[PDB]
Each structure stands twice: as C-alpha cells, then as structure tokens.
Amino acid sequence: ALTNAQILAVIDSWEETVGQFPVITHHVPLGGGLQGTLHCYEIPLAAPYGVGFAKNGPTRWQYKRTINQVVHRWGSHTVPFLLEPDNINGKTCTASHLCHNTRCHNPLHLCWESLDDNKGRNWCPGPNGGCVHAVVCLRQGPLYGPGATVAGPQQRGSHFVV
Amino acid sequence: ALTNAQILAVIDSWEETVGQFPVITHHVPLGGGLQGTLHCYEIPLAAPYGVGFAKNGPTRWQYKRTINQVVHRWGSHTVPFLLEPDNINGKTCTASHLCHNTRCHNPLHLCWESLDDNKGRNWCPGPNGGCVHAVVCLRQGPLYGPGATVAGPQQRGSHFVV
DNA sequence: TTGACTCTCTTAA
DNA sequence: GAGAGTCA
DNA sequence: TTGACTCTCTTAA
DNA sequence: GAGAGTCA
Ligand SMILES: [Mg+2]
Ligand SMILES: [Mg+2]
Ligand SMILES: [Zn+2]
Ligand SMILES: [Zn+2]
Ligand SMILES: [Zn+2]
Ligand SMILES: [Zn+2]
Numbered sequence: 001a002l003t004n005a006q007i008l009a010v011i012d013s014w015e016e017t018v019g020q021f022p023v024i025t026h027h028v029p030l031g032g033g034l035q036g037t038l039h040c041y042e043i044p045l046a047a048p049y050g051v052g053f054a055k056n057g058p059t060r061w062q063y064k065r066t067i068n069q070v071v072h073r074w075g076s077h078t079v080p081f082l083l084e085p086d087n088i089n090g091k092t093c094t095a096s097h098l099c100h101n102t103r104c105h106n107p108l109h110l111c112w113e114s115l116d117d118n119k120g121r122n123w124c125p126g127p128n129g130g131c132v133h134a135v136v137c138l139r140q141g142p143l144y145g146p147g148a149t150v151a152g153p154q155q156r157g158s159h160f161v162v
Numbered sequence: 163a164l165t166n167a168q169i170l171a172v173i174d175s176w177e178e179t180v181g182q183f184p185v186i187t188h189h190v191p192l193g194g195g196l197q198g199t200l201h202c203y204e205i206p207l208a209a210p211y212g213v214g215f216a217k218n219g220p221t222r223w224q225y226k227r228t229i230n231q232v233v234h235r236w237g238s239h240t241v242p243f244l245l246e247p248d249n250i251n252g253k254t255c256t257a258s259h260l261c262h263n264t265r266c267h268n269p270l271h272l273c274w275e276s277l278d279d280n281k282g283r284n285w286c287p288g289p290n291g292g293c294v295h296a297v298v299c300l301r302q303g304p305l306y307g308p309g310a311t312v313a314g315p316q317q318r319g320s321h322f323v324v
Numbered sequence: 325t326t327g328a329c330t331c332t333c334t335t336a337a
Numbered sequence: 338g339a340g341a342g343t344c345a
Numbered sequence: 346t347t348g349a350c351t352c353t354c355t356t357a358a
Numbered sequence: 359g360a361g362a363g364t365c366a
Contacts, residue, residue, distance in 0.1 A: 053327090062361085064327090108316070108317060110315055111311050115335060117310065118358060122282065134311060148250050149273050149279060157181075160181060235340085254339085256338050335357100336338085342353105
C-alpha cells in the first residue's frame with residue numbers, strides 16, 4: 001500500500017500541475033443580491049491536459065501516477081482528499097465543486113461529502129443569502145430561485161383534501 | 163387518448179380510484195420551527211392496487227386504460243397533467259411530489275416541473291423557512307440542513323487562491 | 325511510465 | 338424521475 | 346379488458 | 359458523481 005508520505009507526494013505533484021492550469025476569474029452571485037469573485041483553475045478542453053491527467057468522459061478526468069512499478073489512478077478531483085475518510089453515515093464521499101465549475105480543479109473550490117450533500121448545493125441561496133451548510137458555500141447555487149413549474153397542485157373534483 | 167373529452171375522462175377515473183386509496187396523515191416540518199399536516203392518498207404496498215394501476219418498479223406504478231380498443235398507459239403520477247405541456251424550456255416535465263412521499267397519488271400534493279426543479283425541492287427550507295418556489299412547497303425538504311461534509315477546501319502548498 | 329483514448333458504473337429524483 | 342413487453 | 350408481473354431507460358451531480 | 363482496459 002502507498003505510505004502516507006507517498007500519498008502526500010501524489011497530492012503535492014497534483015497541486016503543482018493543477019496550479020499551472022489557466023486561472024479564470026468568474027463573477028458569481030453570493031446571495032442577498034451581492035456579487036463575488038472566484039478564481040477557477042480550469043483543466044484544458046482537449047488533450048494535452050497536464051502531466052498525469054487524462055479524460056475518461058465528456059466532463060470526467062483521472063489522475064495517474066506510477067509508483068514502484070504499480071500504476072495508481074484516481075478521479076481527478078478526489079486527489080486533495082486522499083488522506084480523508086472515504087465514507088460518512090454509510091454514504092460514499094464525493095468531490096463536490098463549491099464553484100459548480102466541473103473543469104475547475106482548484107482544491108480551494110472543492111469539498112468532500114455525500115452525493116446528496118453535493119447535489120444539494122445546486123439550490124443553496126449562498127453564503128450571503130442564507131446558506132446553512134456547515135462547510136459554507138462559496139456562491140449561490142446555479143439552480144436557486146423560483147423555478148419554472150408548469151402546473152401546480154390541482155383536482156377536477158372534490159375527492160381530495162391537502 | 164387523443165380527444166380532450168377522452169383525456170378528461172381518464173383524469174376523472176384516475177381521481178375516483180386514487181380517491182379511494184387509504185388516506186394517511188403525515189406531520190411534517192414547514193421550516194421556521196413550525197409543523198404542518200398533510201393527507202397523502204397512498205397506493206397499496208402490494209397488488210391489487212386499484213382499477214387501472216400496476217407496479218412496474220419498487221416505487222414506480224403505471225395507470226392504463228383501454229380507449230377505442232387501444233391500451234393507453236401513463237406513469238401513475240403523470241395523469242393529472244395530461245392537458246399540460248410535456249416540456250418546458252426544452253426539459254421534460256416530471257411529476258414532482260410536494261409531500262416527498264412516492265406512494266402518494268394525491269394530486270393536491272403533485273406539481274409538473276423539470277427534473278431539476280423536482281430534485282431541488284429535496285433541499286428547500288420550506289414554506290415557513292424561506293421557500294422561494296413560485297409553486298410553493300408544502301414542507302421543508304427532507305435533505306435540508308447543514309450536511310455532513312467530511313473535509314472542506316484545503317491546499318498543502320501556496321499555488322491557489324479562492 | 326506515460327498519454328490519449330476506450331468502456332461501463334452509482335445515486336436518487 | 339420514465340417507457341415498454343410478457344403472460345394469464 | 347384487466348391484472349400482475351418482467352425488463353431497461355433519463356438526468357446530472 | 360465514479361472505476362477500469364488497451365495500445366504504443
Ligand atoms: Mg456538485
Ligand atoms: Mg421529487
Ligand atoms: Zn472553481
Ligand atoms: Zn450552502
Ligand atoms: Zn402526499
Ligand atoms: Zn420550496
């Protein structure tokens with residue numbers, strides 16, 4: 001098994017490589033009508049992506065390092081969390097983008113939580129709009145708002161009460 | 163079926179059958195420290211479910227009727243909305259449970275909206291906690307809360323800024 | 325050891 | 338959150 | 346005609 | 359949101 005020192009070395013090489021990705025400045029809603037700025041370190045759209053990186057899906061990548069003749073591979077956003085527990089409450093931990101920008105690999109924009117927690121950030125009002133996430137959101141979720149419901153609750157007769 | 167009269171007759175038969183489902187009272191969080199009461203009309207756990215109903219998955223059912231000698235079949239929660247547009251902004255409209263109770267077929271607990279709007283209600287603070295859904299929630303979403311994040315954003319070196 | 329592709333899978337609406 | 342087929 | 350089962354699919358994290 | 363194979 002890789003030692004803790006070897007894992008730290010993987011994290012360090014990952015950070016060195018991601019730190020050289022293009023840094024894109026994004027203005028974002030924070031909630032409460034306020035605007036903030038996030039700086040995303042974005043993996044390229046096409047190969048080459050950076051040392052150790054390869055695309056396994058339209059917006060999926062992996063990081064690969066060969067240590068003592070053994071090939072090791074990780075989901076590209078999971079590397080910051082290799083020294084953390086990988087499950088909680090019986091649920092697998094997932095890399096969760098606080099910036100909601102899948103190409104971003106900035107570890108200051110990532111957290112490590114259940115898929116339900118991850119998804120729920122899409123609708124959060126944001127750090128200045130009422131976020132209650134214990135690990136606070138960096139921005140209002142992209143899907144926050146009144147929604148676009150086509151039809152509401154209704155009945156034709158009198159068979160039902162709410 | 164094709165005619166508006168045929169569609170209304172399908173809605174009316176569906177309402178009459180679902181109206182005979184057992185009515186189960188559920189006390190629910192509303193947000194803001196308040197609690198409310200919903201009356202769900204719950205399809206039975208096992209066959210027979212009711213005239214026209216059959217189970218196609220653990221928590222999936224379909225409603226079927228024979229019209230002009232042809233069988234017409236629908237997802238069991240979609241029937242109230244058969245006269246509504248079946249898409250919005252190019253996204254498929256889905257039956258969305260405001261009571262978050264899949265066995266419930268009370269149309270006063272259903273709306274018709276994109277799958278994203280549907281999902282997002284799981285995290286809504288609720289009608290007394292700040293819900294901004296234009297078609298208002300009936301309860302706080304079951305997944306609302308601080309979450310259980312295992313690790314937050316972090317870096318080992320000095321290559322990243324928020 | 326490394327890059328650039330390929331494939332399928334998980335979850336819960 | 339969906340559609341459709343196999344039997345009786 | 347109606348009932349009770351079977352199977353796979355969609356979406357976007 | 360994931361893991362794993364092939365080829366040079
Ligand atoms: Mg996410
Ligand atoms: Mg729902
Ligand atoms: Zn980012
Ligand atoms: Zn939040
Ligand atoms: Zn209900
Ligand atoms: Zn709401």
